[PDB]
Design a protein around this nucleic acid. Structure first.
Ligand SMILES: [K+]
Ligand SMILES: [K+]
Ligand SMILES: [K+]
Ligand SMILES: [Mg+2]
Ligand SMILES: [Mg+2]
Length: 136
RNA sequence: ACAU
DNA sequence: CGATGT
């Protein structure tokens, strides 16, 4: 329908999938970058999209903000709703860091509360989410 | 199929 | 063209 401009938008960026994963959150209205995660050497697109939403939840909660979060990831929105990131990525020494962060994000969700609406960014209608990395 |  | 996901 209408974009809710008073919101936080998040997105993953990667070099390969699986590959190097990062994410960022921006003010939907202004494009101001509000947070950026240091690149993680191996992860998946969906793991990064999940981490980005959870980081957004933590960021808004710390600031007493009731703004919604936009994500373009059907998968990550569902994983956050379920409090469970159902990634297929093998757990081995190479993937230990991303899996540690995902495990810690799930743990945060299981021990905290939030009312933040997590909304699907409608890329087909509105173009690329404002947190997009411009790499595609 | 749809969403990345 | 390849991959991650419901
Ligand atoms: K997109
Ligand atoms: K991109
Ligand atoms: K597929
Ligand atoms: Mg995305
Ligand atoms: Mg993007």
């Amino acid at each position: 329908e209408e974009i809710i401009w008073e919101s936080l938008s998040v997105d993953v960026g990667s070099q390969g999938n699986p590959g190097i994963v990062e994410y960022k959150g921006v003010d939907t209205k202004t494009g101001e970058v509000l947070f950026e995660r240091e690149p993680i050497p191996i992860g998946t697109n969906n793991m990064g999209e999940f981490l980005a939403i959870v980081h957004g939840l933590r960021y808004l909660k710390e600031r007493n903000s009731r703004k919604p979060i936009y994500s373009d990831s059907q998968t990550a929105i569902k994983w956050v709703k379920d409090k469970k990131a159902k990634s297929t990525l093998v757990r081995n020494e190479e993937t230990a860091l991303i899996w540690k962060l995902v495990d810690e994000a799930e743990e945060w969700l299981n021990t905290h509360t939030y009312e933040t609406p997590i909304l699907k960014w409608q890329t087909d209608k509105w173009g690329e989410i404002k947190a997009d990395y411009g790499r595609k």
